[PDB]
Design a protein around this ligand. Sequence first.
Ligand SMILES: O=P(O)(O)OC[C@H]1O[C@@](O)(CO)[C@@H](O)[C@@H]1O
Ligand SMILES: O=P(O)(O)OC[C@H]1O[C@@](O)(CO)[C@@H](O)[C@@H]1O
Lengths: 578, 577
Amino acid sequence: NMEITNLKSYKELVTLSAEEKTKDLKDYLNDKNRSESLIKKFKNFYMDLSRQRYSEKTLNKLVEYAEEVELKKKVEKTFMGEKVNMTENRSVLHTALRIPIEKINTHKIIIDNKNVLEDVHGVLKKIEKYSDDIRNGVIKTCKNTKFKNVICIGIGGSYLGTEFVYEAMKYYYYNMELNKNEKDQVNNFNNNYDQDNVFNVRFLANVDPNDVNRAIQNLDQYDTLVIIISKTFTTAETMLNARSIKKWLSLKIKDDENLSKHMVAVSTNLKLTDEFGISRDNVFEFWDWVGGRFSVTSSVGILPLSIAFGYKNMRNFLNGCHDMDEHFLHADLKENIPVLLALTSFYNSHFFDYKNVAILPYFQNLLKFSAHIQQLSMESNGKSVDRNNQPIHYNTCQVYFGEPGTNGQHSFYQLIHQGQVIPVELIGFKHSHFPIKFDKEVVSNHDELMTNFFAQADALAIGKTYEQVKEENEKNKMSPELLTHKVFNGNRPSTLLLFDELNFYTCGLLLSLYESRIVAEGFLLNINSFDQWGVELGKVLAKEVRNYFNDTRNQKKSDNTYNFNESTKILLNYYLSK
Amino acid sequence: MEITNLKSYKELVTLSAEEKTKDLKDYLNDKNRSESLIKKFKNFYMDLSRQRYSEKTLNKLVEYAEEVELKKKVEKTFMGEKVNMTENRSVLHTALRIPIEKINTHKIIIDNKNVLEDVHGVLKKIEKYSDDIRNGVIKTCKNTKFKNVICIGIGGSYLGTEFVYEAMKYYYYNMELNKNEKDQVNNFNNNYDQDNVFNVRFLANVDPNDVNRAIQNLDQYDTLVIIISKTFTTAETMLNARSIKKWLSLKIKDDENLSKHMVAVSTNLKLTDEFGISRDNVFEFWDWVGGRFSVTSSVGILPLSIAFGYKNMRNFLNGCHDMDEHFLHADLKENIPVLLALTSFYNSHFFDYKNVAILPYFQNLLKFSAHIQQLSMESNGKSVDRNNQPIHYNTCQVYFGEPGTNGQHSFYQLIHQGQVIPVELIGFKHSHFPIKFDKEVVSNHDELMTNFFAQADALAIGKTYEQVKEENEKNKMSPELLTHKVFNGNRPSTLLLFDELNFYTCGLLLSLYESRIVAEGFLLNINSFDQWGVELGKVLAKEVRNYFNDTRNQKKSDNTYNFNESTKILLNYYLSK
Ligand SMILES: O=P(O)(O)OC[C@H]1O[C@@](O)(CO)[C@@H](O)[C@@H]1O
Ligand SMILES: O=P(O)(O)OC[C@H]1O[C@@](O)(CO)[C@@H](O)[C@@H]1O
């Protein structure tokens, strides 16, 4: 009945943050001991939390807040399969999806007198066989050839995770695997990208027919495999696109048995998949306890990604997710990397009113990561009601955005440096997927990229005072009244994630890091990270407009009665005019 | 004299406090308020009715615009006055789209020269060059027609271009090359592998992974390389320019033949020549063209005319110009970009709504928000006013967004129930690829559009606890859980409804936003035209570059390093085996 804002540890953070606002990051960053403590190590990476507006004592108080909210107990309940999604009375078991086969019995999770891991591995073995058959040409097209194209039909959670992993991993797969490039082997300009096992993967998400146009461009139905991805199998957009692509396939494929060879589905709904006409062997199910934004580790991602890259690569991705899941569950709070990332976020949002998060990966191949983190974070934590079902008014999820570095530096870093304070989350690697270096160059292209990774973090934290600007004006000679424009106040926070390499295992580590961070933060915020009641009103209202459009376009009436406001009426009139 | 102390500003603080007590549901039942807040211009409507203000408060926002002398300031900008006060420079992106018939009437004199003569000189050069590439008059080193175009540029040197490219490509492929008619659905037989369909790539990042993406499946012999940089010094663009030249050099061995595959766009004539580019292969622009306002210059007009034809690009310029004319001449109360800027300013200042979601209900607009992000945030993300005084009031909002309906399954959960985020919805009456099947209740475009109207209403009106309790008599959810289904409403939105996305309309949309940002900068009393905030990171990265060179090559230098305790630890890990 009392809110998290009333806990002793919450009230202490209010006091400590007030003192922290008076302190500079410049002073903290000159303490070697604080740096050595705020730089956390893992086998594959470093998480540098030193450019955060806290002393080690304040961080210890954030850890004390996590204990008071019983974060460990809550995370454990989630992993155990307890019904922690309280508004839907459902389990949250995306972590089960990546438990390896050797642990099927030791790490068993019982839901309705059945070990869920048996269902998990049943589908994974099914994906492994199917993807191997497509890649070996055992499962062929209606014209008895090897499939070349894959159209994934799905929106939100049914494609965002998948496309992030796809885009992140495609060049590692093409370069290190198909082209056999060794790590740090430079200027691989002779690499071949038009070869066997290079699949043309397309994501059809929007109901806008322009997205169908993009999906089908230069594509032959005869070479195309269609994967319909939908948890519910009712989503207005996915289903209109699923029907549209079937009709598109039907333009060339005339026999139903041959058409069946070109269509596969991923859902929790066996009835609706059959009603669509997808064969039982062509349905790769997942379960209700898998939230859409936590679904990439299920058939949602594992099916298209294993076709594209091979199952073995996807098994290593699952292994990475699992190792990070194990760290999340077992590590003490004070040394739990996702927990400390969640606490930092919670601290900035609550105690400094920093209501934005910039996801800035210094890796072009991570161009689809932010779009995934946007759903995972905003749809989970963009809540108004607490776990005690009480409407709350304190800060919930921040607004997430970002572009890969260095791109963002020439777009919106101007604002991150001199406008509103926006905590940044920087992600970097020690190695490239496509190393470049020329003898005349001062640095390798990857190093050039990385100079920015380190520099931006420092520029944000330290700034440049009026006095330093005045000093550098002795040579520049700008009209002295204009010098205020060149001041950088500093004290702008950043986290640095530095991994060694972006391989399938590390990509899984990165995914679980964020999934774990969001789960931890939801419990810190005392909200349900697992529901999405906020998307319902817009669906209801759009069905009314759909019926109105059908009545109006067909110059007729129906059983539906419409009560559109004065503005909607004017714009609908213009919209439906010749 | 800061904005917060002006009479009209204090009055808006008072009026906004009263507005917080009023519901959009009540305002949306007033036909007269709706007729007034729905503005019409040519083939488009701007619906401002789902904004938390009465006609009387909007009139006070118009009174604030008069007190800040918005009209005078916009006019000074168009006239070529040095309004970029920190760099003592003109702001003349509007000059780029003045048509040839207005070269003299609309003349702008800078250093005893009509700038429009330089504008049209370059446009005539682009027209000839793009026609020659498209007709195969200007050929490759193997005397064939170019097929690929690699655009090397970052920030303002590609964002506008890629927005327009992605927005227009299918209109060009479908209505022009495939001759599709508005009355025709299901154009599944359209051909996309044909003569004037160029393979356009954007190489922006210095990350070699971006070079990998740019060159994938590309033959040097078929590839034209456009190096785009205002300065021609940018660390990333120049390293990529040198990297692609070496890549071209792998197959192209003679300098004269290599010259045929490289063109540049810059304000720097020395640096483009010292790079090795021929003067007839340099399509210049000017210092008074800000990067984030540069698409209407050779920056966009050169690659876009190669891809789509100059005639199409001339129509795009005409659209920018018509909206520029509306921006300059329309009365404040009826000025679309000014009213969009005032609304934004009102939400940010008086309601503390520090975000803007750019939500186009058109997949072809997938690169629009990335452009609007720079245009808005790099212009207005400022800390110091035009009187050179550090300020602490709100400046530019955080801009983000994804095309509709995609965003609805990503972050609208938060827009509906989390923090209030004013939305800017953009829609069209027609598709670039209309689809309709006889068994379907609606055309795919109509299905998309049901959401456009519905989301705006859902946000404005909401659903009370009582309405949730009423529909639970049948639903039968455990009553304590009903609070989760409450939608508070009063969440603002602007609706932009255009008839069609053609080259002309795309220009109207671009200038609408450019005009909005210019108006807002003056409302905020900041310089929208400088970017001093990007300098510190460049300086610090050069230090790290030198350090990397000295350490990787195990050799000392004249450079001295003072890295903080954290940078030292991570650099050691970064450089270790
Ligand atoms: O049932 P689906 O088609 O998988 O789509 C659900 C997507 O849309 C949602 O907004 C739910 O409606 C996301 O949670 C989810 O991933
Ligand atoms: O066009 P340039 O000179 O290479 O600079 C590119 C981008 O970098 C900036 O951040 C300027 O530093 C943007 O204004 C500019 O568009």
